[PDB]
Design a protein around this ligand. Sequence first.
Ligand code: HEM
Ligand code: HEM
Ligand SMILES: Nc1nc2c(c(=O)[nH]1)N1C(=O)OC[C@H]1CN2
Ligand SMILES: Nc1nc2c(c(=O)[nH]1)N1C(=O)OC[C@H]1CN2
Ligand SMILES: [Zn+2]
Lengths: 416, 414
Amino acid sequence: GPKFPRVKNWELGSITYDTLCAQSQQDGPCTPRRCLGSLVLPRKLQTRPSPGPPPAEQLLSQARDFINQYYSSIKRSGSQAHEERLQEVEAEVASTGTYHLRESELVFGAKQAWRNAPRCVGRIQWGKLQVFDARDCSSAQEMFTYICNHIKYATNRGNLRSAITVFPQRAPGRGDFRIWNSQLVRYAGYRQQDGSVRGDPANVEITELCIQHGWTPGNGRFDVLPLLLQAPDEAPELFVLPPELVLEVPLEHPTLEWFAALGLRWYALPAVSNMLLEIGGLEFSAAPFSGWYMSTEIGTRNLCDPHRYNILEDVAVCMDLDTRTTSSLWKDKAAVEINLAVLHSFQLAKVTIVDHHAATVSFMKHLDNEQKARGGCPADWAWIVPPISGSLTPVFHQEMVNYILSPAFRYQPDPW
Amino acid sequence: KFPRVKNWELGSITYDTLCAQSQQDGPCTPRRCLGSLVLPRKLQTRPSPGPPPAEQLLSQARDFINQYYSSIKRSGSQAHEERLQEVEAEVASTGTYHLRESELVFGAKQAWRNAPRCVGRIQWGKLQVFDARDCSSAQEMFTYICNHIKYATNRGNLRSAITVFPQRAPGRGDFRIWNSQLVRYAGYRQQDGSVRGDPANVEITELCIQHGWTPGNGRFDVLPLLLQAPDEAPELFVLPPELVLEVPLEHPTLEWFAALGLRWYALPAVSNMLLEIGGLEFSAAPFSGWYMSTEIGTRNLCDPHRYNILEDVAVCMDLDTRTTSSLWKDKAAVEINLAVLHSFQLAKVTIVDHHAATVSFMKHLDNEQKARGGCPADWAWIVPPISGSLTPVFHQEMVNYILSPAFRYQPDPW
Ligand code: HEM
Ligand code: HEM
Ligand SMILES: Nc1nc2c(c(=O)[nH]1)N1C(=O)OC[C@H]1CN2
Ligand SMILES: Nc1nc2c(c(=O)[nH]1)N1C(=O)OC[C@H]1CN2
Ligand SMILES: [Zn+2]
């Protein structure tokens, strides 16, 4: 039939064709010879530091393309304002080598980047995003103020609101604005004498970086790390978040009374801060964004991953399961109870959260909306399907097409 | 060119050089990944009314013969060169050729070893190969099939096996087993759009009835086989009940579970895939091993488009089906997979849980890295349907490509 990828849902038997992928202008890591779709950090998108100013041409075409997307979103494609903005952009790049976005263009680009993220299952909310324009920020100290305002607004005392703060873009012949921390909220990871780790193993390096930069470490499993903010050409400055700004949820179980005694907990705000926001060729090296958690991120990955908190065995022992044999499914049982605890504790604390069933059901709805709206939706199957109960959620049975669209959120090298 | 593959749990890294041996194209391109699609748009295996190009067939053949003599370390011997002579001579004159039993045995094992979607490949070297190429009727296929079943089941101590029927020929139709598996439960489309039994088998159940089968009306009625000999209408054969080992499901602690009347057969035998060896195609080559508990407990019994028993079990457990946040689905699912493991083990029937299975696959990935410099794996199929990140394969990056010998999908004969 149609010359576009044919996509099938095996639960419903329905079919669709992805025409949106025809708009992709950035190559992925796959070829007809082999699929590299399951690689976390394949070397393509990877926004490696490209110091020396970019080719006035490649920048222009990217810019023109973005401006077209913008005028199309407001329905003025081909108008005088559209042709004037195009002229104004190339004129800017013509003398300065770069250009700037109008306020409304930044808001549009930012939402679109979220909309284009193949690995995000919460995209049904893409239209509701608070965009804080912080392109006037000129110091590491101001960055901190902006971030604190972000955390405050986004947290909204448990009734979380999606938001993103955009700091100044990459400027040729000038340093980058960078947040060294992967997330605005991170638990310290202390490398023990015996080689083990106290706290969160994922954050061992950043923890040791904060220390080397004057941070006085603690010794708990849930110590909130300080922020390492870097302004152009200056060394990173250390900033401690005021405890009142970091909302946390102590974990307890609805029926297993001993669970509370485990002393487990997690913060309410998931805010990625080390990714690069790219719009029309312009690169925003510092643009932290936040939403709310899907229960499996905490209950399954963060708490049960072998290289993270790894509490599966502890809980199983408390539940008196046979951890000596796989066939007892002690891991499966404990994990289920841990995820339930996360859901229960967040609900009790009146802090926003969404389980993997509701999350994926709503993503299916997002897929229908996008099918009608753009003729498809780029999606990374391995990241969309939850870490537990895969085939129990609708997305498992939904084939997906993955490709790169811009604006986009990209990975970037560590500043150190 | 060679992909860097990483395991995020251990931080270890390997480079896949085996993927360079791929000669067949997948569905992906630099523009977009289609790695999650179950079927190709047309990569299948088109008709065989005409002879395959001598140039192409000969190259696939020579490549295979090379693979074979290399496996027995006689790479270069006179035997090797003369076998190439034979194949060349046969293709040149007849437009095709035939395999020796030893080569066919090597090819079958290699096809399994190269199957990207198979998580039990650590067993790849242990495969009983039944040569059924001297078959000329559906009736004969049936006899071979029952022998395969009796041997593979082995009173509960399942043994991996494959039966290979006559290859495809340009001058005639194919030998085909219409059923997708040698053992399947009927799916009757009842008046109200409903479906009694396994919804996955509605179409094949109708075909059997269309060809004279007297249907039952249970939820687990073993279907009869529709075997097709070249250019002939398919024939109906009922499998001797004593050959079809079934396991009644009960729970180790929940007494009421058994009351549900759930059961599942012991032998998983795919019979609708095409086995390709050295350019030759075997349209009928049923193969079997043993089940991984999640295939039954999670997919077959819990998929919404299958038996869909999740809710019934939840209610029996008296769970809160009001909201999704109570995780009633996850809880019922775990118990169902537990009931499956308990029952098969009680009945002394071979089964493997998803933790043990993936752990063995990780070891297999390691063996293959040293042996061939890589291993094609389909991440979406390798990672189990429940407790994905609780297993080691989830954290393992994987490269997927097509190697030959291969098991491929082919069109439905009807
Ligand atoms: C509204 C609630 C939201 C939910 C429940 C949600 C949920 C998720 C989940 C489950 C992941 C995978 C995380 C992981 O496994 O590491 C993810 C990834 C992602 N989300 Fe969303 N998301 C939401 C909001 C946001 C917002 C506001 C943005 C940006 C404006 C966004 C951008 C992304 C991106 C870029 C990724 C991929 C990051 C990577 O490649 O590692 N998400 N999201
Ligand atoms: C020894 C026990 C074995 C186990 C535990 C095992 C397990 C599995 C599992 C879990 C699947 C996915 C099933 C599905 O989701 O539909 C699979 C697929 C597959 N297995 Fe294995 N396997 C074993 C033996 C075999 C044998 C003997 C062969 C062939 C000689 C084989 C060939 C394949 C192939 C070709 C696929 C993909 C089938 C398809 O595309 O539907 N397996 N295996
Ligand atoms: N959501 C999500 N899915 C994922 C991942 C991840 O980090 N997040 N990855 C891992 O953690 O390991 C590999 C890969 C597979 N699927
Ligand atoms: N094992 C296994 N994994 C799978 C599948 C399957 O059939 N078996 N597919 C489905 O059932 O839907 C899509 C795709 C995803 N992963
Ligand atoms: Zn791919």
